[PDB]
Nucleic acid binder design. Structure first.
Ligand SMILES: [K+]
Ligand SMILES: [K+]
Ligand SMILES: [K+]
Ligand SMILES: [K+]
Ligand SMILES: [K+]
Ligand SMILES: [K+]
Ligand SMILES: [K+]
Ligand SMILES: [K+]
Ligand SMILES: [K+]
Ligand SMILES: [K+]
Ligand SMILES: [K+]
Ligand SMILES: [K+]
Ligand SMILES: [K+]
Ligand SMILES: [K+]
Ligand SMILES: [K+]
Ligand SMILES: [K+]
Ligand SMILES: [K+]
Ligand SMILES: [Mg+2]
Ligand SMILES: [Mg+2]
Ligand SMILES: [Mg+2]
Ligand SMILES: [Mg+2]
Ligand SMILES: [Mg+2]
Ligand SMILES: [Mg+2]
Ligand SMILES: [Mg+2]
Ligand SMILES: [Mg+2]
Ligand SMILES: [Mg+2]
Ligand SMILES: [Mg+2]
Ligand SMILES: [Mg+2]
Ligand SMILES: [Mg+2]
Ligand SMILES: [Mg+2]
Ligand SMILES: [Mg+2]
Ligand SMILES: [Mg+2]
Ligand SMILES: [Mg+2]
Ligand SMILES: [Mg+2]
Ligand SMILES: [Mg+2]
Ligand SMILES: [Mg+2]
Ligand SMILES: [Mg+2]
Ligand SMILES: [Mg+2]
Ligand SMILES: [Mg+2]
Ligand SMILES: [Mg+2]
Ligand SMILES: [Mg+2]
Ligand SMILES: [Mg+2]
Ligand SMILES: [Mg+2]
Ligand SMILES: [Mg+2]
Ligand SMILES: [Mg+2]
Ligand SMILES: [Mg+2]
Ligand SMILES: [Mg+2]
Ligand SMILES: [Mg+2]
Ligand SMILES: [Mg+2]
Ligand code: NA
Ligand code: NA
Ligand code: NA
Ligand code: NA
Ligand code: NA
Ligand code: NA
Ligand code: NA
Ligand code: NA
Ligand code: NA
Ligand code: NA
Ligand code: NA
Ligand code: NA
Ligand code: NA
Ligand code: NA
Lengths: 211, 255, 96, 203
RNA sequence: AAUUACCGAAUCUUUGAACGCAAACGGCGCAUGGGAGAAGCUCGUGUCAUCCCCGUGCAUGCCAUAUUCUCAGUGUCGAA
RNA sequence: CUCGGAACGUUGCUUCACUUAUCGAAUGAAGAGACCAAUGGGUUUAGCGUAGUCUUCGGGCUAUGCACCGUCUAGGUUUGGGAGUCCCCUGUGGGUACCCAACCGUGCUGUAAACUGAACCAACGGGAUCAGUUCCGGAGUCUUGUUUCGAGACACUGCCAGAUGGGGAGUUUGGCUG
RNA sequence: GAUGCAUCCAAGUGGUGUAUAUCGCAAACUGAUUUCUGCCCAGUGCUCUGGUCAACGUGACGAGAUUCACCGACGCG
RNA sequence: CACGAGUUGUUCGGAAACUGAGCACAACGUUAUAUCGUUUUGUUAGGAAAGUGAAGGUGUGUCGGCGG
RNA sequence: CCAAAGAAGGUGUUAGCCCAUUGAGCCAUAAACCUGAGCGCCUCAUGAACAAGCGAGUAGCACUGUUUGGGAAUGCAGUGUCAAGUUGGCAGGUAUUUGUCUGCCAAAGUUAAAUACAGAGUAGGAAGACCGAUAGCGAACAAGUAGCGUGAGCGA
RNA sequence: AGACCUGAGUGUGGCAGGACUACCCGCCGAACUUAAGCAUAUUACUCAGCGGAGGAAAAGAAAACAACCGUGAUUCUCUCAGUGAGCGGCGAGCGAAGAGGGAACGAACUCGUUGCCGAAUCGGGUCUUACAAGGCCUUGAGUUGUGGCACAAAUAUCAU
């Protein structure tokens, strides 16, 4: 089918062409172990379900009706910041301790600027493998980005280790990231053809050297 | 003025080909894995005539390389092809008349027909009756074979393009005088609506640039430019020379 | 069903068979060929005419021959079974 | 917010990264149909600016129009009359390609109401516009005060009457005062005012 | 149970955007309900093969939708 | 005035190599390439070093090794190893003449003067649970991916410019006057 | 010699000769044998080898518009 | 001219129900504009247009066969 | 003799009183309409007091075409090129470069009335210094009829 | 296995299609004619052609005029004005706008943005006499953002 052919040829073209650093930075994702650890933390601090929020608000209403003088806070339990607008606000206000950005968002321009904003505001950020995996962590179908703003004392050590391992890959390698171009990757058949051609012309010019 | 007949013929209409009673396109068999690596053996079942063509056609029966069935290709027969003959098509086919071989496997100086201009083209050169190409040389650096075409031109083609061995049947059709407008009528009946031919000087100025005058003459030179618009490009188109050729015919065509 | 009008199955044959014919040829066929001539629905079937004769006049039609007249009506020649008298059925219908 | 970043990123259309994205997208679009239904807009910021909401009843279609000037469809380029009206190739359509794309979408899908459209891509031969359409039979649309108006009959095929933004652009309604005095409310209306012969009763 | 006038309720053949498919054809379907059946069976009584009849649905595109229907992809992951 | 160079960034052309845009073919997009191994790829196939050079101290980045991805073959030719003619009647029937490595080879069971036979819906063998019941190979495997082939960043697409262009369009082709 | 020649068409992955393949397609002229077809390339065509001719570029004066120089293809010579 | 009649089919002709020169619905492109193009050289459409089923699973009815 | 009625239609000649008409009124009503945003009830809403941003292949600009009274270009279209926003932009009807002033804030959207009905409809009205059967509509009448043309059409 | 991205099939619920077309909105678009010829011009941004609405349509809430002592969305009328505007083989011809007197007018609102929120949103079930602008439930859609509050006619909103 035409859609199958086009989805394969699109990947072929993206590998063959010269990819500027701003787009190539999404190819160099966080490693598998730290990605799993970050997803574990995000799933632990996932937002509450519709039912859970509704029950919490019902309980708040009952605590209000018990006596109007006592004021009960309606704030939700501590969770991750989810959504492009909310995550952008957290980064801009420098409230986020660690940001996670999916690498397969299309249109890419939704999050193409996010690593640079995180670098400018000096917030640790990681680029991970799937918005689908982020959505599974947060209870939705997909998620462009997720921001951890605070954790509990039990998870503070995990957050610090995650921040260090993430900074190893992304924030401390800013000079390399800003300059590394991607693409220009040959096909397997082209690489084999080049190798065989070099082998054929290995020693043709041996008689032109004086030694 | 009115539209010229040479431009009216481009609309199709009643000037198309009389394809009824024709057996179909005459092509070599497809360039499959068997042709590219080994060979296929087929049996010539029948030799037939197609209306509008001066050469004989051969119905050659092959087995399907992937299915339990038979294929029955229809090709232009080289001269000498007979019913019951075995035709071998592929890389490992022997050099015999009627066999289809890649042009790189055919010796220099060989006479071939049904030559492919491109690999897989299924044959487009040297297909008129009595016509053939001559293999001049091979170039293994670039992988190309040089041929002398029926017109006398030289053409370089990829060495993977196939070619049949021999000349096309029905050769010598043009040496018999027709002698009769009726014979010409029956000849063109199976080809198309192109006969009889009225001279441009015999028409009126409205339809043709050559028409008109109290004497039957072309007022202006009959050699026209290559950039002339349609309706004006009638006569001798972009002629490099005119008159009776003396001292040797040149090879016609672009360089 | 998007069609909600009440349609009765017991009155269908009154539409199939309209009225008999009393012309010279029609009455000539009654006595000798056991044949009754009727004007029937123009969109009717020979099988439906055979069934309508059974439902209306309680007779068996061994053959029906239909023709559309030059004036647009449809005329059926219905030959009754030999067990039935076409003259008796014509008398019951009301033509003689 | 994120809108500012997307807006500046799409204002930087000649940069290396945006040229790469647009080249890949133009190839992908070139290998598709003339009209293509999309789940989500390619430019959500522009779509939301022009009226799109991520609600039920809103649709986005990418429409392709060939580029270049108009050719007068006269037989063999032969025109009869004054030499003034003799050009066959140098004439230009008095309607823009965005309006043409909107009209093609609206004429193809007559059960939808065309709201707006925006430029997404163009190459040497094609030009792509994303057209926002609304379903007038959707309860979400029919009960929303902000898109309710499009359910009315005066808005049927507004893109064919030139009431969309591109239609207003090529009608000249982008200008007011001395710049559009003969074009308001329309050039036909101004012509009627200026050319009708008025016969007062007592004169 | 006059007849006029007016209208809220009903009927409304064959077509036609005409839309199951055709068409100088009162043609021919496929589902899904009915009907009539003088062969056969059953005990004129049922029931009824072939046949014949009738109602309803069935164009194409789009949009929404699926108690969250069934799938495709050397698309991206993720198991294994 | 002219001429000579760097050693830089940039670039106007341009050779040559390439392939992904594009173009030309063919095909029922029916067998491409590799395995024969880089001037290859992986920190979701980058593991182990080394030397610089950085670092947000978590790690990189440049070179440069080594390892992995990643392998199987018809046939040809020669190197090692083991290892099983018989019936009936001279005839007949049935059977055996292996394996391994290397190198070449390169996907390879058929012909080479042709003169009209047939071939489908597997036999069979392994592994688990005679025959089931499943797997597996028979019938190699792999994929930085492209249906294949030929071209290939030119000629293919717009727009702007100039020539040419009765092929066609519009118009005109004074007056006085024995 | 086919990514061809002629040519349709407002346009397109559009159309005809072409289900073709130089013993073929397309465009002219003369008009069966037979016997022949002289001389002329100046003109006008057609055709094939090394000053001027557009846009675009490139630089410069000037506050800039403007300007100027340079480059510039068929074609024509 | 008026009035009243007249055309009877299992097998006749057509249709159901073949292909031809052809046409052009879909599809796809094009067009300000579909009321345009393509649509048989085996044959639509960059094109997922097969609703049909060879075996064998399993039940059901009609056989033969085996033993009991 | 009537007139709060003289109104102009009918009826065998020219009718206020022959007839119908010519007026207050009366009666009956799906919904909608209108009426302390008519008025209850239930439900559901709801009023008053107790720092940064603002619409980008857009606006320009060049070339070409077109349109305009718009003229060193009034709008628009094609293609090229393409902003500003920290002398921010746009307009101020002679092109340029300045620097002052004024008005305004483009590139999403909705909106009633006053306006058209220059060969439309639906349900009604009022008519006329109009035409009067070769006129006025083609058609005062079984007129887009009869008839005519292969047809588009034509048409008494 | 599975996801979600892209794309199919089917069920279910809808809608488009034609007519009309006087007026109105978008395109496309002549020529006869006039210039005592004719090519620019004129006819005419007209006829014919192709789309699309409605009882009207379109326009419409200032990137507006102006240069005032200023005015204040649109539309229409008289006037400006056949113009000591302009345009034009400056020929034939063509040709507006501001101001002023009026008609109309409860005339204004909505989104994106930016701040602050963040599913409070939307469909679908079910219930309330209710396909409630209500309750309850619902992954169904939506976090690639639905909804709220405040932006000059403004100066908080949010409780109780
Ligand atoms: K002829
Ligand atoms: K175009
Ligand atoms: K012309
Ligand atoms: K005005
Ligand atoms: K897959
Ligand atoms: K290729
Ligand atoms: K002779
Ligand atoms: K000459
Ligand atoms: K030259
Ligand atoms: K009277
Ligand atoms: K200012
Ligand atoms: K409006
Ligand atoms: K009007
Ligand atoms: K009216
Ligand atoms: K005159
Ligand atoms: K005009
Ligand atoms: K006023
Ligand atoms: Mg003549
Ligand atoms: Mg001529
Ligand atoms: Mg002559
Ligand atoms: Mg002559
Ligand atoms: Mg009959
Ligand atoms: Mg135009
Ligand atoms: Mg206006
Ligand atoms: Mg039908
Ligand atoms: Mg390390
Ligand atoms: Mg490293
Ligand atoms: Mg490195
Ligand atoms: Mg002669
Ligand atoms: Mg001579
Ligand atoms: Mg008669
Ligand atoms: Mg018959
Ligand atoms: Mg045919
Ligand atoms: Mg064809
Ligand atoms: Mg009240
Ligand atoms: Mg009240
Ligand atoms: Mg622009
Ligand atoms: Mg003009
Ligand atoms: Mg003008
Ligand atoms: Mg603005
Ligand atoms: Mg009056
Ligand atoms: Mg008369
Ligand atoms: Mg009359
Ligand atoms: Mg008359
Ligand atoms: Mg018109
Ligand atoms: Mg009104
Ligand atoms: Mg309106
Ligand atoms: Mg004018
Ligand atoms: Mg919003
Ligand atoms: Na043909
Ligand atoms: Na002549
Ligand atoms: Na292929
Ligand atoms: Na000419
Ligand atoms: Na002429
Ligand atoms: Na003339
Ligand atoms: Na000659
Ligand atoms: Na002659
Ligand atoms: Na001749
Ligand atoms: Na000469
Ligand atoms: Na020069
Ligand atoms: Na009165
Ligand atoms: Na319509
Ligand atoms: Na006024």
């Amino acid at each position: 089918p035409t859609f199958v052919t086009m989805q394969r040829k699109k990947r072929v073209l993206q590998r063959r062409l010269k990819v500027p650093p701003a787009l190539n930075q999404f190819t160099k994702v966080l490693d598998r172990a730290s990605r799993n650890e970050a997803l574990k933390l995000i799933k632990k601090y996932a937002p509450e379900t519709r039912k859970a929020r509704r029950e919490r608000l019902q309980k708040v209403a009952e605590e209000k009706k018990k006596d109007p003088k006592k004021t009960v806070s309606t704030k939700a339990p501590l969770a991750v910041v989810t959504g492009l607008q909310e995550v952008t606000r957290a980064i801009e206000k420098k409230q986020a301790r660690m940001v996670v950005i999916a690498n397969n968002v299309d249109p890419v321009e939704l999050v193409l600027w996010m690593p640079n904003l995180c670098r400018a505001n000096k917030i640790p950020y990681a680029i991970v493998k799937d918005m689908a995996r982020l959505g599974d962590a947060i209870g939705r179908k997909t998620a462009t980005c997720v921001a951890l703003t605070d954790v509990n004392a039990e998870d503070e050590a995990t957050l610090k280790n995650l921040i260090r391992s993430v900074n190893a890959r992304f924030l401390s390698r800013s000079d390399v990231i800003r300059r590394q171009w991607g693409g220009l990757q040959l096909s397997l058949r082209s690489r084999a053809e080049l190798r065989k051609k070099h082998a054929r012309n290995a020693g043709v010019d041996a008689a032109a050297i004086i030694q | 003025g009115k539209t010229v007949l040479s431009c009216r013929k481009g609309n199709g209409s009643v000037y198309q080909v009389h394809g009824h009673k024709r057996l179909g396109p005459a092509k070599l068999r497809i360039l499959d894995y068997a042709e590219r690596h080994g060979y296929m053996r087929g049996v010539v079942k029948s030799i037939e005539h197609e209306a509008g063509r001066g050469a004989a056609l051969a119905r050659v029966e092959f087995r399907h390389p992937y299915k339990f069935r038979r294929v029955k290709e229809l090709m232009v027969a080289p001269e000498g092809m007979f019913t019951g003959q075995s035709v071998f098509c592929g890389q490992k086919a022997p050099l015999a008349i009627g066999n289809v071989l890649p042009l790189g496997q055919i010796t220099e100086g060989c006479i071939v027909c049904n030559v492919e201009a491109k690999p897989g083209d299924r044959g487009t050169l040297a297909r008129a009756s009595g016509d053939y190409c001559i293999i001049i040389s091979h170039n293994h650096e670039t992988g190309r074979t040089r041929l002398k075409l029926p017109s006398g031109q030289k053409k370089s083609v990829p060495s993977t393009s196939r070619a049949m061995i021999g000349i096309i049947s029905g050769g010598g059709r043009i040496e018999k005088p027709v002698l009769k407008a009726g014979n010409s009528f029956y000849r063109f009946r199976g080809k198309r609506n192109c006969w009889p031919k009225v001279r441009g000087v015999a028409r009126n100025p409205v339809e043709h640039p050559h028409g008109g005058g109290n004497h039957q003459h072309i007022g202006h030179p009959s050699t026209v430019s290559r950039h002339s618009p349609p309706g004006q490009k009638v006569g001798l188109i972009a002629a490099r020379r005119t008159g009776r050729i003396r001292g040797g015919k040149a090879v016609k065509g672009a360089w | 069903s998007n069609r909600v009008t009440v349609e009765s199955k017991d009155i269908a044959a009154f539409n199939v068979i309209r009225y008999p014919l009393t012309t010279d040829k029609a009455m000539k066929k009654i006595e000798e060929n056991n044949t009754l001539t009727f004007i029937v629905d123009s969109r009717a079937n020979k099988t439906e005419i055979k069934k309508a004769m059974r439902k209306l006049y309680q007779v068996k039609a061994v053959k029906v021959n239909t023709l559309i007249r030059p004036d647009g009506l449809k005329k059926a020649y219905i030959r009754l079974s030999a067990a039935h008298d076409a003259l008796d059925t014509a008398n019951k219908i009301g033509l003689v | 917010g994120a809108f500012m970043y997307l807006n500046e990123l799409w204002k930087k259309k000649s940069s290396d990264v945006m040229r790469f994205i647009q080249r890949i997208r133009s190839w992908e679009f070139r290998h598709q149909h003339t009209v293509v239904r999309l789940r989500r807009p390619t430019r959500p910021e522009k779509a939301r600016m022009l009226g799109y909401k991520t609600k039920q009843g809103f649709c986005v279609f990418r429409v392709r129009v060939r580029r270049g000037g108009r050719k007068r469809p006269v037989h063999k380029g032969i025109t009869y009359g004054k030499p003034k009206t003799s050009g066959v190739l140098g004439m230009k359509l008095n309607k823009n390609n965005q309006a043409v794309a909107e009209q093609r979408l609206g004429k193809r899908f007559g059960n939808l109401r065309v709201l707006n459209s925006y430029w997404v891509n163009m190459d040497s031969t094609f030009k792509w516009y994303e057209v926002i359409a609304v379903d007038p039979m959707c309860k979400t649309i029919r009960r929303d005060p902000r898109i309710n108006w499009i359910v009315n009959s005066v808005h049927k095929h507004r893109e064919q009457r030139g009431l969309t933004s591109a239609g207003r652009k090529h009608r000249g309604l982008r200008h007011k005062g001395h710049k559009a005095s003969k074009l308001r409310p329309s050039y036909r209306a101004a012509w009627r005012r200026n050319n009708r012969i008025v016969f007062l009763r007592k004169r």
